[PDB]
Symmetry: C3
Subunit: 341 residues, 3 copies
């Protein structure tokens, strides 16, 4: 037993950026770019086999498959092997981060890469990723279900395998989930004694060029909401903080930012309008308030369901970053199509 699946999603997206620093014409406005873009098409193979008494073996190989022909490689999307049974589920491989799964109730938009921060809640999703790791998921007991996941010190840094001279970048991920009559709330987060971030607060591999080492890197996320009776509402809160670990005068100083995201949608028959807001409060960088990281964004859109597998998509987004003259505003809109197989 093995099945083939995936989804092909593409559309045309119009965008324009307002930046006074990089564009000098007309009050900092760039020209409007119109493109055909892949919304992240993917194709995978998964299978399962009953082993006898309550245990089943499970594997999956999923790849990024852009219909523009820009992707390549196997298992770059969730791909794994594991075992399931009464005890729950245990998987190893390129695995989604518990915080990446919790992303399903946080970001419901589709878009191309270039517009992932204005046509989708991309900024609050800068903490999500896939890591080579092991992961446990306990069954659903009384509406409760949980997940614990770990990334080895030698998987987070291979170069340092035999000479442990760099602080371990090993990390733990966990999440808890409660569901009842259409009401659901969940906590998801991750902690890393030592890790590296780029200037976009995203986690990068040790020794990336412009990467800033950090200590006690922790990410927290709580998402609660209602999903049933043609109605969907979702509020999410997220806190991120770490201590500067880059040798120099500012080592030890604190980094932190709070983000909130809101989304609601109603299902009229085959049309589902939807709206989402997101904000990133002023961020503390090296102990000081940094307003460059503050942002406000709102996305409105609707999905037309031709069938349970095919949808037509339309959406627009207004995004503002920073404050003052270093400020950047992004507006974009798209129309596209999604087919799940």
């Amino acid at each position: 037993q093995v099945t083939l699946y995936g989804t092909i999603k593409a559309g045309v997206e119009v965008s324009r950026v307002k930046d006074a620093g990089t564009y000098k014409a007309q009050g900092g406005k760039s020209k409007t770019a119109t493109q055909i873009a892949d919304f992240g098409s993917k194709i995978g193979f998964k299978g399962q086999e009953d082993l006898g008494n309550g245990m089943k073996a499970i594997w999956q190989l999923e790849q990024k498959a852009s219909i523009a022909g820009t992707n390549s490689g196997w298992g770059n999307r969730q791909s794994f092997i594991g075992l399931k049974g009464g005890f729950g589920t245990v998987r190893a491989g390129n695995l989604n981060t518990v915080l990446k799964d919790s992303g399903d109730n946080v970001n419901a938009w589709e878009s191309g890469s270039n517009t992932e921060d204005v046509l989708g809640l991309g900024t609050i999703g800068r903490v999500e990723s896939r890591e080579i790791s092991v992961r446990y998921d306990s069954p659903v007991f009384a509406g409760f279900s949980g997940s614990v996941q770990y990334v080895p010190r030698d998987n987070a840094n291979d170069v340092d395998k035999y000479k442990h001279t760099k602080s371990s970048r090993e990390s733990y991920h966990a999440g808890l989930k409660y569901e009842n009559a259409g009401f659901f709330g969940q906590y998801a987060g991750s902690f890393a004694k030592y890790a590296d971030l780029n200037t976009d607060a995203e986690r990068v591999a040790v020794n990336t060029a412009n990467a800033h080492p950090v200590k006690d890197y922790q990410v927290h996320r709580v998402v609660a909401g209602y999903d049933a009776n043609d109605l969907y509402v979702s509020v999410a809160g997220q806190y991120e903080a770490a201590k500067n670990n880059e040798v120099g005068s500012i080592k030890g100083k604190k980094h932190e930012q709070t983000q909130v995201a809101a989304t609601a949608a109603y299902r009229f028959g085959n049309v589902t309008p939807r709206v989402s807001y997101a904000h990133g409060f002023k961020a503390k960088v090296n102990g000081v308030k940094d307003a460059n990281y503050q942002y406000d964004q709102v996305i409105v859109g609707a999905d037309y369901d031709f069938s349970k597998r095919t949808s037509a998509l339309v959406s627009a987004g207004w995004l503002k970053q920073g404050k003052g003259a270093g400020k950047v505003e992004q507006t974009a809109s798209m129309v596209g199509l999604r087919h799940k197989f």
Copy 2:
């Protein structure tokens, strides 16, 4: 509903090149090289879903899959998503160029890459390609069927997305087709206000190293012929011209070349002999006659059909390029196998 398809084609090809400039031994003759080569094996996944009243959703991901293990990546061959119905068909993605489809009645040979110009009509097919774009194909009305296709300015040049400082490389492609009782004629072509060509008259991405910018780049192709009753005959004509747009003394001057190709084949039971000729008249480069682009080529061969999906292939080709001492002659022959699945 989703299907798996592709074809595996390989063979051994013998070749020798006669060039007085690069080879000094024996009147300019090179040694004879004999290789095992992939004839362009490929594998793809496509699927369709009825949406209700006369509309069907359609997608396809096809990749180059060489059995020599030299290819990599997804959707580098025609890959797309679109909709079909009474109105015809509409597709977006890595799509074949209307001129690339018209190639089916122009080049019927199989070969490895190194011999695509001597074991196949490759020179007349230097205008064919795949471009990220949208494309319309109207139904077949009274033997008539048509196709209109467009490649965005920001898809033909991504770097220039927000600062339109480079002339648009957006292009249009169209073709018309008539079929009646085994008789068929079609026009296919493309126009680009601005584009770039390499010295082989092939279109390359803006800012390729040795790439010459051009203006009013247009390609025309007419192919007519008979295909039925065990008989196949096909004549094709092709015109290409553009104005030099490379800043300097020769900007504005005219480039152009006319190419013709002929092919016929008769089906004795399971054997199908075939022969093809092709010529490239002297080309006008910067207004001046250039005989380096002139060429003559003839390919003879036969296909043995073991079954409708499997064939045995044999072919030879004599090709002469240019005139005089800069002249190059290529001769090659091959025996191979093709399995379609």
Copy 3:
């Protein structure tokens, strides 16, 4: 007719290296590295079609598919097209080397790349590989079955296609096999008039940076053993020798090394313990005895079969290389899982 297959295999492996030259702490011992690693997962598509009277067409595209997401490309594992029938089988493409197939009775261990020499008989398998080539396999007559395979001069070196100025790196591979009532012995080997080796006695492509050209490169392997009644025993012998062909003072001098490998395993119900030993006698490099190439290794382990397709794996290995102060000792152990589909 076409089928999908492959296997997903991963596990965690603990390792430590003892080298006095590269590690200075504690008598040359490195720290112990613990990793999650792909044991070489792979996925392929193969198909066959009856052509009529006793002939069938056969093709296969197999790719390395790591569940860690580190592989990419098509047909990098055995991939081919060919014909089968009364006469036996004939294939062309990325094909396994006759010596690579004989590897099945020589190395029965699973492991990640980093531990292929301590958790598997990797050193004796440094002569195995895949080469673009043609290959014949004659049927099994009276327990006897044979294989002859060849790699073209222009496939082993493409750059030199038209100017044969580098000595041909074309090579021949052959093997013979006898099987009777659980008893089986086979010879497998390869010869190359000219070839290139790296310092690990592995064959590399001409013009690799640190590659040493050789002449009369021959590899011999005899493997005999018993496989039936829950019992498996296998002894293998291997000889390798070539003449230095690197221009200089030592050209012409002789290189050679003898390797032996032993493995046995008994099948209690679903558990199969197993043990293997391997030795590499002192090697003659440029006529002189080199003890750096001498080695001793022993691997113990067991496989728990959950089902015919799924197994649980456990293994450990002690490996010593060289002699004296340049000496290197490797110890490693792993626990993992393998699912065949």
